[PDB]
Design a protein around this ligand. Structure first.
Ligand SMILES: CCCCCCCC/C=C/CCCCCCCC(=O)O[C@@H](COC(=O)CCCCCCCCCCCCCCCCC)COP(=O)(O)OCCN
Ligand SMILES: CCCCCCCC/C=C/CCCCCCCC(=O)O[C@@H](COC(=O)CCCCCCCCCCCCCCCCC)COP(=O)(O)OCCN
Lengths: 16, 97, 75, 96, 213, 48
């Protein structure tokens, strides 16, 4: 679903 | 503080309403927004901007498209006076003349 | 020429520049250049057979189009 | 010919200047919606706003039954969620 | 022969691609200014709307990358302007308007003959991070309405999965990250020593103006 | 502000080549940087 991809970021992407 | 509790509630309501609509009517992942929606919303906005620039000018210029009135004399009074003395000739050419 | 004369005869060539010459793939062909030469000659004759500033800019035109021809014939 | 206009209030170069000024003002108003909309992403892009709706509705129940000591203690929770951007990313996460 | 001619322009093989939108647009801006400044009225009013509307259609064909559409727009516009301005409408002002519109028709034809490139998305002023770029970017933002209309127009014609609220939040983050980047660069090229007072001239200049205002 | 400029320019590349699934996933990163004040002090630090 589009709105469950837009609203699913976490702190692991902004890692290394 | 009262008014800060009332603002948090208003905005949490609006988000809640939108979250519901997007669960009842889901959209597939990676699906382009349909052209109709785009052309509708966008179209209106663009039009508003033109009508906040050109239309005011247009209306003012429309007002300027008017006429003038033929104010013909009612009386044409003519006098011939020699110096200080009583006029030699006086005539009032009115409407028929 | 169309900016000075501002007629309806000098409208044909500017339209054709923008829609036959500049949109032709390799180079404007022989037929474009020959059309322009023939049309400008005609207008000269027609205006002759009918003011005091009629065929001055058209002399420049015709001589410029014949210059091009000479380069496009030496290469 | 004489001339009597009816809507002649819209005349003069002062009216031209007025028009320009109107555009400027409206322009700044429209900019409002398109300018700093990135500054309120922390308070407007919340994933699941359900746990905050329960706190807001419990402040209201307490006001009804007049147990005003708990109105103060529940106001303290709401104010410390909006004062720590990272406890709102824990309270507003999709619990699936 | 007509069919054959058109085929060529639309489907050839000698098409080194280029992007001349930036400039096709500058000609249109200059025109706009002439019409407005030299207004010396229904004529001016109608013409202003015309110029505005051509600019909108132009953006659409750029973002949607259509050569057939640009061909048709050229044909129409060439004929229309050459008739309206030389029969209906009728002057140094109109003599210019014409010269500058002739430059537009020339640059447009180059694009229909050369073809659109692959990467057409990305601002013109945000490519180099200098000082000229910063001042032109900031100036373009000041013209009332330009920034907004660009954003909405690009949304309607580019294919995106986001809405308008979200489109416009990505465009704002980018504008402000650009301005910070420009300033970070200038302060690496021209550093200032640690603990050095700001020079009196700078102070008296900036401050002076503000007080006077 | 360099690592954010790369995310903003990668949203644009994806829009060009029409791989719209990655436009959504890269919008999620940009929105969760601006929703956590302390992950912006990690992403925007001078890497010397
Ligand atoms: C590297 C920069 C050095 C070169 C200097 C030349 C730039 C001149 C100064 C630029 C700032 C001044 C803004 C003038 C217009 C922008 C020209 C430009 O940057 O060229 C821009 C065009 O900007 C636009 O896209 C605007 C189009 C939307 C507007 C259409 C409706 C018109 C609204 C009303 C217009 C009336 C008059 C317009 C302006 C009035 C007075 C300014 C290039 O499209 P771009 O970035 O997608 O491109 C993509 C890759 N090339
Ligand atoms: C609101 C009702 C009050 C009545 C006042 C009516 C005026 C309303 C706005 C009129 C515009 C006044 C300009 C204010 C000057 C500050 C600019 C600004 O961004 O101030 C903004 C709002 O404040 C901010 O965004 C804060 C940022 C301050 C940045 C300071 C300088 C930035 C740009 C200045 C140029 C720098 C160098 C450029 C060189 C070449 C420039 C040609 C007001 O502008 P605007 O954008 O919404 O402009 C668009 C339509 N007029």
């Amino acid at each position: 679903d589009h709105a469950t991809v837009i609203h699913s970021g976490d702190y692991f992407l902004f890692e290394s | 503080s009262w008014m800060c509790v009332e603002d948090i509630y208003a905005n949490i309501f609006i988000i809640k309403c939108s979250r519901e609509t997007e669960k009842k009517y889901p959209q597939p992942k990676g699906q382009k927004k349909k052209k109709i929606v785009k052309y509708g919303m966008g179209g209106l906005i663009i039009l508003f901007l033109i009508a906040i620039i050109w239309f005011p000018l247009l209306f003012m210029s429309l007002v300027r498209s008017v006429v003038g009135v033929v104010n013909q004399p009612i009386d044409v009074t003519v006098t011939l006076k020699l110096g200080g003395y009583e006029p030699l000739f006086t005539m009032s050419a009115q409407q028929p003349s | 020429n169309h900016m000075v004369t501002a007629s309806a005869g000098s409208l044909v060539l500017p339209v054709l520049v923008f829609l036959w010459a500049m949109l032709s793939i390799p180079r404007p062909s022989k037929r474009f250049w020959m059309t322009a030469i023939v049309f400008t000659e005609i207008a000269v004759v027609v205006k002759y057979l009918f003011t005091d500033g009629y065929i001055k800019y058209d002399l420049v035109q015709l001589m410029a189009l014949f210059f091009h021809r000479s380069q496009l014939l030496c290469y | 010919k004489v001339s009597p206009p009816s809507l002649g209030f819209l005349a003069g170069y002062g009216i031209m200047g007025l028009y320009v000024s109107i555009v400027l003002v409206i322009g700044k108003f429209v900019r409002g919606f398109f300018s700093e909309i990135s500054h309120s992403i922390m308070f407007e892009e919340l994933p699941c706003v359900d746990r905050i709706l329960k706190l807001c509705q419990d402040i209201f129940l307490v006001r009804e039954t007049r147990e005003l000591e708990l109105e103060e203690e529940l106001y303290a929770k709401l104010i410390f969620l909006y004062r720590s951007p990272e406890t709102m990313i824990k309270w507003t996460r999709e619990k699936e | 022969p007509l069919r054959r001619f058109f085929h060529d322009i639309l489907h050839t093989k000698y098409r080194a691609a280029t992007d001349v939108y930036a400039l096709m647009f500058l000609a249109d801006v200059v025109d706009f200014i002439i019409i407005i400044f030299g207004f010396w009225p229904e004529a001016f009013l109608v013409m202003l709307l015309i110029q505005f509307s051509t600019m909108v259609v132009d953006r659409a064909l750029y973002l949607r990358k259509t050569v057939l559409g640009k061909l048709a727009f050229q044909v129409a516009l060439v004929l229309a302007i050459h008739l309206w301005m030389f029969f209906i409408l009728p002057n140094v002002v109109a003599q210019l308007w014409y010269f500058v519109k002739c430059i537009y028709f020339a640059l447009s034809a180059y694009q229909i003959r050369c073809g659109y490139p692959t990467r057409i998305l990305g601002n013109f002023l945000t490519k180099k991070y200098n000082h000229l770029n910063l001042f032109l970017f900031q100036g373009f933002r000041l013209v009332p309405f330009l920034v907004e209309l660009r954003a909405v127009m690009d949304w309607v014609w580019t294919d995106t999965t986001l809405s308008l609220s979200s489109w416009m939040c990505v465009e704002d983050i980018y504008a402000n990250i650009f301005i910070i980047k420009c300033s970070r660069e200038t302060e690496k090229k021209y550093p200032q020593p640690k603990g050095q007072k700001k020079k009196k001239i700078v102070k008296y200049g900036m401050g002076g103006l503000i007080i006077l205002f």
